[PDB]
Ligand binder design. Structure first.
Ligand code: AGS
Ligand code: AGS
Ligand code: ADP
Ligand code: ADP
Ligand code: MG
Ligand code: MG
Lengths: 339, 49, 49, 49, 348, 319, 328, 261
């Protein structure tokens, strides 16, 4: 029940004199305004304008723009005098069991409209959190009400959705947004907001964001407020992400020094900078395919850090796992350096 | 009259996998090379697992 | 055959099973319990498997 | 290509499947039934048939 | 009413060996606000007798009365389970491990009802009810997390002695809030002393040679020593220094199995040894016990370079055995790989 | 005028039109022909034809009385204790005049959402009224049904469908729809439907509505799987033990945005039917299962796929 | 009735916490404005992060309002993120009136102290981020993690992050002297030094072991033996005997030594820790060092998987045995 | 700045118990014309509408148009402790977030006052035109309550049909079918109402039992009720409260499907 109170209060909510949520500044409005995934949006426009909209499954990593897209589609299909009469919005906030599917959903999909005649629509945000029996009733309520009401399923993990439910709808994946298309957006935000930023700043902003403009705006917002300047160092310090120079020195210590010296240096740096061994493993793996090695070095090293990433999951001692991480390089690469 | 052995593999749904001429252990004993035969052996193990 | 037992030991440990074993008791051949009677309530599981 | 990731063969079997039974079980006479009773008795000597 | 329970010490001062930490436990119960205790040591070293002695020291002798009560609990997955628990008016006894992956469930509600019992039953003796969780090494990770949530919710309501053999599977947060009590195995002379004590308490007199031989054969397991001594008593009314101390029958069946291991290396021998291990597992012997016994048997004939190799393949295969569910496959994998190595070794 | 989905526009109405699990098909055919069917539990993969077979069996056995002597429960209905208390017992006691050998029929669509106590109630009702009433049920996992419900029934098994059968039904439906196509689209549309042709007709309709022509590129634009040729190239590089290119295009799939789980599943189903040595195939399968357990336990990163690929590649060089 | 010393002896106020200077400055400035931000405390455990946040909440609010306006939870829940999210929603939704008689009214936002902030997945952390943005104004949080690196980026962009470096051994030696003199227990300074060196810079574990030791002894002298076996710390001559058996050339004395370790009750984990600590700072070859340390790592995995202590120790000693005896 | 004086609190209690289960919350909008409520179901299948004229209240005062939203459960908890004969005051400020219910003394010795927080929500003015209905009847409320609760325990849904013969109720339940036929010559003796039609064409639709039972929870408001019904424009239940206002109800029918061959 409710929780639409907080969203409706939140939409025109800002201090507007001191708060500056620039993530909330730049919102696309319609499919012609969402400048990404243009094939998907044009396909939606084609299916809408032919009265041939199939059941939809919009899935992808969060923040890629599924909810605003389907909100634009809903406002396009139906005017503001009949939007609540034809579109039902739900999510996992109102989880009481499977009674949602046989309650509001089954009652809503079983009736005609109220004022004007036309096909209806239900959007189910975060439908991955629906239980297996809830989804298993949801497939039936789709099957026996397919001609009256179309269904939109907003999801984040494709695999968990039961096969028949993905079978009765077509699917659209909101993939990561390509960096070549995301650099002009951040350049526009920077020039509009008079921000000093270098090329490593753009590179770190797009690399950390992993094709999400919301998360990029969050990072640049935080760095601009915390420092007033944005670069690789300022972003990574504000993020608390591994600095590339630091992990480069970590790699240098395993590839040049001996066991004990590199061991205590990396231990002191982890204490000094607050790093957990998972992220060192990720960033050194990012360095492995870039630094030139023979193939045998690459397979042996990759297998060993894979097994270390396994062993770190169960929750063993991180100290001995760091030691084995140094040992992986000490076995092969430093022996060849001696050679 | 002719005997009617073979309700055991029919119970496990193995007749939905193999040919009616094929027997279970007869298919097990020989060498598996054909891609279709190997998918039927995969489906057999998939049913028992 | 020793290589085969190495493989099937790998399929016991380092392959998951379809149904999670020892879900309600321990492994088989145990005198502690194993009298896991089925459920008696109409409330759904609400599990996240 | 055809059958690149599966068993899509150009040739297709016809007449091997769809073998309808239409089986009419003739009612057993006294002699063959008693022979089958004695077969059961020789299979299970401890059963009061 | 065997020798281990009839002649069990009842108070802290009646303990015969390891007097010092018994006195420290007396100081702990004298302080009156002891936090949760974890107690550990090898089997037969005297953990449970120390636990019940500090229980009897803690409350009155109403600890000494014991009954059995049965608990039926619905799972979060809605499949009820029935377990048997030992109970008293002052303490509770739970071994959760019988629930398997549902150990976590057995963590909360009984203790919660024990909390409710602490909210219900008032005697003005002490402000908590203690419960002994047995074999906490077999608790799963989520079960231990649920235990941590239970203890950081009901620290002022109930207490818990944690009987285990190894704190390895105990996660470090559980080790962080519970006081460690290491209970080492008794020495040979201590076993002989308490053994002569229980024989004089039985009215029997034996030579010290039998006591020392029995102490060495028990391998610092005092419970096994007392049971075996009772077996020697059943064998002979008088005690003679060369009385044949009996051998454990599954141990010697395992020994003949190992004889079949080292004798012939044939696939028929593998299958018949597999049937022998089937007989052992139908006799409900734990798989790690079977493994430890068989490796300790077979290592006596192994040469120096073979012993180490057998060591890492045994540890690796038993790592998979605890990773695995059905121990049969891992045990047969070990035995067949040892067939391969051993046959490769006498041929060169 | 309404766009009827082809999954229900081309659902069979006669039992012979259903392919797959042909022995049980013939048994259901003879039970439709004669009658006095026992209680049936159909179990199999989803989208196999279980509900179709049950409904066609009911239609063939009843005929005009299908609106009265038949009653249906799915997970959309209540299916609690009180309805299996009142409604199903009231029908099982309800008098219906039928031809000889013909019984009232109750269908429990996808009985895996029955609660345990609901089945415990259902047992006596289904076993005492067996003179006039028969029960049919469908499920995907038989273990979700309690043991006495099986023990009071005959249970039948359905399997994932043979690709030749799927190919025949798809050429049938594109003949009845006049669909322009290539063979490329046929192997794509079937690879996207591993034995479950409900996916085949669904993605067929999606391809025809979205592009209007059937070829591999259109199928993989609408279904959005990682490309079969890319992962075939991955395992081919594994055969050559060439780590560089295989990792490069794996990183390409990663920044393309595919999840860990469908990548490892596609890797499985591509190195399954790949043309290469059987022993190395066995090693590859066990390795990809091992890495899949890593994703399944929670840890799902590029480092995991890199170590996957590395052990795959070192399998070739190490004898 | 009585309380453990760790909360009994934690500082009441910020400025009373020692060894941290910029942290005290920024927390004091945020307390002066009566608008504490959302905090993210990272550093080794026992460094005083919980003590600092409790002191800050005690300074901002009233002591009777302190426990009312804080809710202490942990985040590695075995029942999922939905349960703790529902508790957070229940605590934020439930509002109780609060005032101070000291002359300053309390801020309207409450405090939820959620520890182990480095232990969740990215999905659960994103759910917590949505919960964060749900209650941005009416509750400000303090996430305590061992490592800031595991924090996903939307949280780290809106939280004031504070490093807590471990304290130099002299200052917590002085603090433990203060505890000992205020808790009337006879301890030698060598005992306090040994307690520090087995505490490994963890002041919270140090004072926990100190209170536990003084209640074990009941007022007697806290010897080195009781603090040797209250932390589970293995005696060092046992480690030396293990290395001597590995150097010796006999597997019989190897398994005899392992049997001596296991029937003593000494856990395999602590043995692996001290074996590793010896090996990392030795004159051994880096090839041998690497082979032994990867063996140690996989043995740690094996024992965490439920394997026997004895088997893993035999295999570990066999590998160290072969590595030492290869050069000999 | 808003003052309303409910003449009798029995009407307010009656409308609240009439809509107690229907809706999540009550969002009223006030104008100099009067007070209005057009709130549409959480399951999104029905709408309650209530228009009360300014002259119906003892004193109605407005400064501007205001739409405020109130949670229903606490509103019910407050109003269930009020006398039915009482005169009530509803006070709303111009920009405050609290509405005041000033109940006069039911016991003539204790004036009661209660407060309610305001809950912000997106509410749209569902401005449906009032088209000409092909079927209009007037028929007493208590009879319509007794027949819905009659057919509810029979059927999970009711087939309404309106023809020249009269108004007709069917319900095919599992126990069996239930039919009720009324006539225009059929005049009742319980409240002395002659059932009438102003219909044009026969129409048959199907509606759920639950909502109609909770529409009959609005029985004591008016003696007779007006049913308006069309082939496309859905079911209208209209109570005409004496000098207070009118209470319209929009319920959409269930879809109907033809059985396959
Ligand atoms: N392609 C895009 N271009 C511009 N803004 C975008 C784009 N995608 C997302 N956004 C922003 O994201 C906001 C909401 O997007 P959402 O639909 O909520 O993202 P999502 O993919 O649905 O995943 P969630 O909602 O975070 S779980 C919009 O208001 C935009 O500011
Ligand atoms: N073997 C088949 N032959 C012909 N059409 C089929 C077959 N299997 C599925 N279909 C079609 O796909 C639809 C799905 O069939 P169902 O029987 O509902 O699937 P199922 O095997 O019962 O598994 P479910 O429905 O996921 S529990 C049918 O309505 C047909 O249109
Ligand atoms: N001081 C003692 N006097 C007599 N018997 C003892 C003493 N200490 C231990 N024992 C015996 O040793 C056995 C050890 O069993 P238990 O108490 O369960 O400890 P553990 O848990 O280590 O096996 C007990 O049966 C007990 O009878
Ligand atoms: N800098 C310090 N000044 C004063 N006391 C400290 C300091 N650091 C640690 N302590 C003591 O150590 C204990 C650490 O507890 P806690 O705050 O939980 O540490 P953490 O939050 O780092 O785990 C506190 O109770 C406090 O008494
Ligand atoms: Mg979204
Ligand atoms: Mg089906």
């Amino acid at each position: 029940m409710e929780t639409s109170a907080l969203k409706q209060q939140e939409q025109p909510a800002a201090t507007k004199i001191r708060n500056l949520p620039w993530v909330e500044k730049y919102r696309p409005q319609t499919l012609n305004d969402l400048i990404s995934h243009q094939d998907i949006l044009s396909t939606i426009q084609k299916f809408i304008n032919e009265d041939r909209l199939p059941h939809l499954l919009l899935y992808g990593p969060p923040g890629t723009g599924k909810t605003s897209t389907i909100l634009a589609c809903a406002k396009q299909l139906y005017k503001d005098k009949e939007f609540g009469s034809m579109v039902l919005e739900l999510n996992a906030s109102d989880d009481r069991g499977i009674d949602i599917i046989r309650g509001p959903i089954l009652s809503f999909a079983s009736t005609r409209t109220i004022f004007k005649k036309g096909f209806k629509l239900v959007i189910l945000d975060e439908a991955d959190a629906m239980t297996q029996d809830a989804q298993n009733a949801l497939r039936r309520v789709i099957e026996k009400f397919t001609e009256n009401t179309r269904f939109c399923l907003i999801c984040n993990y494709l695999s968990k959705i039961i096969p028949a439910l993905q079978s009765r709808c077509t699917r659209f994946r909101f993939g990561p947004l390509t960096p070549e298309l995301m650099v002009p957006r951040l350049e526009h935000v920077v020039e509009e907001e008079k921000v000093d930023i270098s090329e490593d700043g753009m590179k770190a902003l797009v690399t950390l964001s992993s094709g999400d403009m919301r998360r990029a705006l969050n990072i640049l917002q935080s760095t601009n407020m915390a420092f007033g300047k944005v670069t690789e160092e300022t972003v990574y310090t504000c993020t608390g992400h591994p600095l590339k120079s630091d992990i480069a020195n970590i790699l240098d210590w395993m590839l040049n020094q001996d066991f004990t010296t590199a061991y205590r240096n990396i231990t002191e740096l982890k204490t000094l900078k607050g790093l957990a061994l998972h992220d060192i493993l990720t960033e050194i793996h990012l360095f492995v395919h870039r630094v030139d090695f023979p193939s045998s070095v690459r397979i042996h090293l990759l297998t060993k850090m894979a097994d270390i990433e396994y062993r770190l999951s169960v929750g063993t001692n991180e100290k001995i796992q760091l030691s084995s991480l140094i040992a992986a390089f000490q076995v092969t690469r430093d022996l060849i350096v001696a050679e | 009259p002719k005997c009617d052995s073979g309700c055991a593999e029919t119970l496990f749904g193995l007749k939905n996998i193999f040919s009616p001429s094929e027997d279970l252990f007869s298919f097990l004993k020989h060498k598996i090379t054909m891609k279709e035969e190997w998918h039927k052996f995969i489906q057999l193990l998939t049913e028992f697992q | 055959l020793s290589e085969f037992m190495d493989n099937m030991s790998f399929l016991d440990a380092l392959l998951t099973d379809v149904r999670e074993q020892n879900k309600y008791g321990r492994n088989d051949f145990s005198w502690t319990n194993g009298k896991v009677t089925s459920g008696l309530c109409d409330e759904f599981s609400l599990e996240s498997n | 290509a055809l059958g690149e990731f599966s068993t899509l063969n150009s040739k297709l079997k016809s007449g091997n499947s769809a073998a309808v039974f239409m089986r009419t079980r003739k009612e057993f006479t006294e002699e063959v039934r008693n022979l089958l009773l004695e077969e059961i008795r020789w299979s299970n000597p401890e059963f009061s048939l | 009413s065997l020798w281990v329970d009839k002649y069990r010490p009842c108070s802290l001062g009646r303990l015969d060996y390891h007097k010092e930490q018994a006195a420290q436990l007396r100081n702990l119960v004298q302080c009156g606000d002891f936090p949760h205790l974890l107690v550990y040591g090898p089997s037969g070293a005297g953990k449970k007798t120390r636990i019940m002695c500090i229980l009897r020291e803690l409350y009155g002798v109403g600890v000494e009365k014991l009954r059995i009560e049965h608990q039926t609990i619905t799972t979060p997955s809605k499949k009820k389970i029935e377990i048997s628990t030992i109970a008293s008016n002052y303490h509770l006894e739970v071994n959760p491990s019988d629930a398997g992956n549902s150990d976590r469930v057995v963590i909360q509600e009984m203790l919660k009802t024990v909390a409710q019992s602490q909210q219900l039953e008032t005697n003005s003796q002490r402000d908590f009810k203690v419960v002994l969780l047995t074999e906490v090494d077999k608790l799963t990770k989520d079960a231990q997390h649920a235990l941590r949530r239970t203890m950081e919710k009901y620290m002022s309501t109930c207490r818990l002695i944690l009987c285990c053999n190894s704190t390895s599977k105990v996660i470090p947060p559980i080790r962080s809030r519970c006081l460690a009590v290491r209970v080492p195995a008794p020495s040979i002379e201590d076993i002989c002393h308490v053994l002569s004590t229980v024989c004089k308490k039985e009215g029997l007199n034996l030579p010290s040679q039998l006591a020392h031989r029995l102490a060495e054969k028990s391998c610092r397991n005092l419970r096994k020593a007392l049971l075996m001594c009772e077996a020697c008593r059943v064998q002979q009314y008088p005690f003679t220094a060369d009385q044949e101390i009996p051998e454990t029958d599954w141990e010697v069946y395992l020994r003949e199995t190992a004889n079949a291991i080292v004798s012939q290396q044939t696939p028929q021998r593998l299958l018949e040894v597999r049937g022998r291990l089937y007989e052992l597992l139908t006799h409900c012997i734990p798989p790690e016990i079977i493994m430890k016994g068989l490796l300790s048997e077979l290592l006596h004939n192994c040469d120096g370079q073979l012993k180490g190799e057998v060591a890492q393949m045994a540890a690796y295969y038993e790592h998979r055995l605890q990773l695995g569910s059905k121990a049969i496959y891992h045990l047969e994998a070990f035995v067949a790989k040892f067939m391969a190595l051993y046959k490769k070794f006498m041929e060169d | 005028h309404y766009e009827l989905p082809w999954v229900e526009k081309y659902r069979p109405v006669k039992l012979n039109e259903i392919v797959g699990n042909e022995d049980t098909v013939s048994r259901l055919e003879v039970f439709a022909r004669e009658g006095n069917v026992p209680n049936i539990i159909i179990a199999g993969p989803p989208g196999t034809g279980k509900t179709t077979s049950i409904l066609c069996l009911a239609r063939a056995l009843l005929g005009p009385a299908l609106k009265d002597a038949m009653l249906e429960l799915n997970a959309s209905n209540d299916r609690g204790i009180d309805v299996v208390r009142n409604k199903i017992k009231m029908f099982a006691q309800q008098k219906v005049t039928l031809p000889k050998g013909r019984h009232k029929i109750i269908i429990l669509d996808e009985a895996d959402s029955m609660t345990d106590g609901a089945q415990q109630a259902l047992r006596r009702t289904m076993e005492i009224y067996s003179k006039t009433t028969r029960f049919a049920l469908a499920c995907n996992a038989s273990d979700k049904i309690i043991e006495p419900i099986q023990s009071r029934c005959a249970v039948l098994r359905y399997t994932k469908l043979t690709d030749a059968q799927i190919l025949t039904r798809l050429m049938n439906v594109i003949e009845k729809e006049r669909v322009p196509y290539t063979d490329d689209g046929l192997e794509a549309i079937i690879f996207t439907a591993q034995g479950d042709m409900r996916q085949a007709l669904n993605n067929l309709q999606s391809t025809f509505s979205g592009f209007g022509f059937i070829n591999s590129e259109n199928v993989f634009k609408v279904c959005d799987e990682p490309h079969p040729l890319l992962v075939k190239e991955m395992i081919q590089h594994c055969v050559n033990a060439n780590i560089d290119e295989a990792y490069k295009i794996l990183a390409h799939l990663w920044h393309l945005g595919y999840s860990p789980e469908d990548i490892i599943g596609n890797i499985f189903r591509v190195c399954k039917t790949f043309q290469m040595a059987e022993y190395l195939k066995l090693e590859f399968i066990k390795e990809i299962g091992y890495t899949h357990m890593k994703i399944a336990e929670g840890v799902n990163s590029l480092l995991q796929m890199a170590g996957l690929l590395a052990r795959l590649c070192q399998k070739t060089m190490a004898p | 009735k009585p309380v453990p010393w760790v909360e009994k002896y934690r500082p009441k106020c910020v400025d009373e916490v020692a060894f941290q200077e910029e942290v005290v400055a920024v927390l004091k400035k945020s307390l002066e404005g009566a608008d504490l931000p959302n905090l993210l405390f990272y550093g080794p455990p026992g460094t005083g992060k919980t003590s600092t946040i409790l002191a800050a909440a005690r300074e901002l609010f009233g002591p009777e309002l302190f426990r009312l306006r804080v809710l202490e939870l942990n985040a590695s829940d075995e029942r999922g993120i939905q349960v703790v999210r529902e508790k957070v929603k229940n605590f934020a939704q439930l509002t109780v009136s609060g005032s101070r008689s000291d002359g300053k009214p309390c801020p309207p936002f409450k405090i939820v102290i959620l520890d182990e902030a480095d232990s969740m997945t990215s999905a659960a952390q994103a759910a917590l981020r949505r919960t964060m943005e749900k209650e941005s104004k009416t509750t400000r949080f303090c996430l305590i993690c061992n490592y800031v690196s595991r924090i996903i980026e939307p949280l780290t962009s809106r939280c004031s992050k504070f490093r807590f470096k471990p304290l130099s051994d002299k200052i917590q030696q002085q603090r433990l002297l203060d505890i000992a003199k205020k808790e009337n227990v006879k301890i030698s300074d060598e005992g306090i030094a040994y307690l520090v060196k087995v505490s490994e810079g963890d002041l919270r574990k140090a004072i926990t072991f100190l209170q536990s030791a003084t209640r074990l002894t009941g007022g007697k002298e806290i010897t080195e033996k009781v603090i040797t076996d209250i932390a589970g710390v293995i005696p060092a001559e046992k480690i030396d005997g293990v290395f001597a058996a590995c150097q010796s050339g006999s597997f019989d004395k190897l398994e005899a030594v392992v049997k001596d370790l296991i029937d003593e009750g000494h856990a395999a984990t602590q043995l692996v820790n001290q074996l590793h600590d010896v090996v990392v700072e030795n004159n051994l070859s880096d090839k041998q060092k690497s082979i032994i340390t990867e063996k140690l790592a996989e043995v740690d995995k094996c024992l965490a998987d439920g394997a026997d202590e004895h088997l893993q120790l035999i295999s570990l000693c066999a590998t160290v045995m072969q590595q030492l005896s290869q050069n000999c | 700045m808003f003052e309303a004086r409910l003449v009798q609190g029995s009407i307010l209690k009656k409308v609240l118990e009439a809509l107690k289960d229907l809706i999540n919350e009550a969002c009223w909008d006030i104008s100099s014309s009067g007070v209005n409520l057009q709130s549409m179901d959480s399951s999104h299948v029905s709408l309650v509408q209530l228009t009360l004229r300014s002259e119906g209240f003892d004193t109605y005062r407005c400064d501007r148009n205001l739409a405020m939203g109130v949670n229903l459960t606490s509103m019910s908890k407050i109003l269930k402790c009020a006398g039915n004969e009482d005169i009530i005051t509803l006070r709303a400020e111009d920009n405050a977030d609290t509405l005041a219910l000033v109940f006069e003394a039911p016991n003539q010795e204790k004036v009661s006052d209660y407060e309610m927080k305001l809950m912000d929500l997106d509410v749209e003015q569902l401005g449906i035109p009032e088209q000409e209905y092909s079927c209009v009847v007037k028929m007493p409320s208590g009879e319509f309550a007794r027949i819905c609760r009659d057919l509810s325990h029979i059927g999970d849904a009711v087939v309404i049909s309106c023809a020249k013969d009269g108004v007709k109720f069917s319900a095919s339940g599992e126990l069996g079918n239930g039919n009720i036929k009324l006539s225009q010559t059929s005049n009742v003796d319980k409240e002395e109402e002659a059932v009438t039609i102003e219909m044009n064409e026969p129409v048959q639709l199907t509606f759920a039992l639950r909502y109609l039972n909770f529409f009959t929870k609005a029985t004591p408001l008016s003696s007779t009720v007006t049913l308006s019904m069309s082939a496309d424009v859905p079911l209208v239940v209209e109570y005409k409260i004496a000098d207070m206002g009118h209470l319209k109800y929009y319920l959409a029918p269930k879809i109907e499907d033809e059985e396959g061959s």
